[model samples]
Target: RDWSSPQQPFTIYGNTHYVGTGGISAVLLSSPQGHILVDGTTEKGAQVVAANIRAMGFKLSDVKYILSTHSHEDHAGGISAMQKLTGATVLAGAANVDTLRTGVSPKSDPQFGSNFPGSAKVRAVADGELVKLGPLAVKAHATPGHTEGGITWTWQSCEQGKCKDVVFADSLTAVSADSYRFSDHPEVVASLRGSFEAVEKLSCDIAIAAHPEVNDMWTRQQRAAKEGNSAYVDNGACRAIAAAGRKRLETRLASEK
Candidate 1:
């Protein structure tokens, strides 16, 4: 699966729909009042996101907020086009605000692949701030590891009378560009460690990784046909994601030595 490859959109749970590309993840948290978009896939994948929303019987104009996981190209690359299409306020971590506006990663970014379309109408949200839109309330959790501005979004979605806490988790893998040493940046290393703990403690009923496969999204998706939304409900998901991240960090640290 490639980031830009087309994937048909589907519903993950009540009011939450998967509208991203084949590889990347973009989710739609919808309501009659308005909607919230989680992440846009890529520059070309923006078209997929827009079309998927429409396919799921939603209007682009109803999207009230476009939340970002990080400002990297594979994730935030389509924010500019998506913002224009939805005319929604783009909310991200304070550390990522300038990167989103300028569409350029600062030297501090681990990957530093620097350069995507600069998104307009972007704003910064604090760690515990709630993004309210009528009946929708999504809280932001600052989980900066993979990037300085990485954020993990959480919200409740209901089916019948049961509601589940869904987490759109940020990437936690210890991946960096050439010559970027994790050992050199003690602060970055500390941030990644803190993020793992934070994510592990979240009230996460369903965890959707920035890259879907990390949480077995496709496997559960296929199982959904037989099992229903219960296929995606794994209480240990957040813990598992954190464990994987911690292991990756350990491996990276050891490799550096």
Candidate 2:
């Protein structure tokens, strides 16, 4: 799906269209040269994402950076395929480098094994680090809790010379899994909450999620408001969702007795 306009100078690809197997992947096409892909859906979904990139008037080989939110299969499953196909460097947080290097899926605390190959060459991204793709600059903020190295990418944009907005990806909740590793790490959860608050402070005009349906919630509510409906955009909505996950984490930690 075309998540951006030609005039916007940046585009979001691989949402909703490739939603299945509990994986969320998307690409940000920057102006002038190259593009930054958020995650490569799954082992089966990488080909589709690569094709989608080409359809957007870009060659798959043009993708320079592949950032994995965390090393979960659904999120980073396609990294190997993408690297083999496009020669893009895989960038991930240092905390998860071992997991990515070993191709071990963190499905369990003590056991590290994945359904797909976990091996890939990766570069460590530091907090507050900025990755530049042509004219676009993405700031990586470490937001753990979902995983030790879970991160959120923020980018600035001016669309059609009309408005400026920031795009955020995956700030809350771990992609579908039996349980989140950081759930047991209360301090980690607290830190993630702070990151969420920080993003809110940015007062971004446009907010997006790794999942299209969730991101659409904002637009859907906006449309509802225009019809003189009771619909409203409140911070509570996102907080509530995050709270639910937080509670689940707390409860799971307790049950691990």
Candidate 3:
């Protein structure tokens, strides 16, 4: 199993919960009506996710929607299993529809051919489209580059009379298997640029990285423990994230070239 999966589930503000494996992330956005699952780790990891959900006193059947920040296996691989267990419909962006339907990463994907089984029960939504469930509504933004149809989800997690804007940002790494360079793909160049800008403009007080470590989740989490939820309400958090992301992408391009 993934070492990143936490031993138990933990609260990430008010209604949002972290229910992923040791390393990989599968966040749960809960509402009295039902719940929204952000990302599922792997095939077997889905079952583990179910256990985590139940451990948090949430019913697996109450999960109405399952989504991903991107179509990579580690993130979207468990959609099929989760669907079977929860009967939740898979909601994805149009660009990532094929990736979810095929359960295989696109050839252009950084880890091409990675097996992350998908679901036939899926619906495609446009960018800026909202997936509403009771009091929770999640906005989908297509932030490409990591994958042709990479996405980032934004919503509000209200807890104990305090609500904050949350952004579940996708992986910003410009990774490729071999000679595949993000700069080589003209379309990808535009996508990456737009994605970076889109992410920077997002109003996120609490930023949740798809992979927890991407945004210094551990350190911030510790701070949250001592300082309360206010420690996570940073205004310019995504700025440093994108700055470092662009640097890495440029470095990757230079090394690959």
Candidate 4:
């Protein structure tokens, strides 16, 4: 599925609904009091996300916060539109706040893509800060390989009496513009390594990649038909995603050498 392609919304588990586009992953941690949205897909994908939320029987006015995974166009592109629609505060990492507000990535950004729309309500949250909305509390982990402000959010969603730790992992893949060099940025490299370790240690019962396909999200979703939401509950998922990130980093480093 393409990044902005239409996809049916489904519950990943209790209070966690997949409200993203076909490729990008946006999750809605919902409650009767209000709701929290993880990512906003593409600029055009804002409409898709809004519709998905409505389809799931939630009102746009009830979205209390829009948490960003990173400042990339594909991920934060719709945050501006979404914030305007929901009137929700947008929380992101300190490094990403300027980018989110200005809708412009600095040259340090590996991808360094074109500018998209900017949000006015974006705020920076410190690492390990808790973003609370009524009964839901999401903890932010700084995972800054993909971007200076990349974040991996974690929260617990309970079904019946079973609560699982859910992680919205940021993009850990070592991707960049053609002229960028991993060798040139030692701080970026260090952040990536730290992120790999940080993600590996999370109490993650279900891990959803920023790019859904990275963790076989569609495969898990299809299996949910028979296995129920249990299909998404793989404790090894966090480590697996971290392992892939390490592998990608190693590969990128080797290619640079």
Leading candidate by lDDT: 1
Q: List the global CA lDDT of all models.
A: 0.94, 0.58, 0.81, 0.93
Clashes in predicted model 1 = 0
Give the Å shift of residue 191 in candidate 1. 0.2
Q: TM-scores, in order shown?
A: 0.99, 0.72, 0.94, 0.98
Question: How many Å off is the CA of 185 in candidate 1?
Answer: 0.7
Candidate 1 overall lDDT versus native: 0.94
Cα lDDT tens digits for candidate 1, 1-257: 89988899999999989999999999999999999999888999999999999999999999989999998998898889999999999999999999999988988889886588999999999999999999999999999978898999999999877899999999988899978999888899999999999999999999999999999999999999999998999999999999999999999999999
RMSD of each: 0.7, 6.4, 1.7, 0.8
Q: How close is candidate 1 to the true structure, as a TM-score?
A: 0.99
| Candidate 4: tens digits of C-alpha lDDT, residues 90-175 | 99999999999999998889988679999989899999999999999999999997899999999999988799999999988888
Query: How well does candidate 4 score on lDDT at residue 13?
Result: 97
Evaluate model 4: give its lDDT. Answer: 0.93
User: Residue 102 deviation, candidate 1, in Å?
Assistant: 0.9
Root-mean-square deviation of candidate 4: 0.8
Q: TM-score for candidate 3, please give it.
A: 0.94
Residue 88, candidate 4: alpha-carbon lDDT: 97
TM-score ranking, high to low:
1, 4, 3, 2
lDDT, model 2: 0.58
lDDT of 3: 0.81
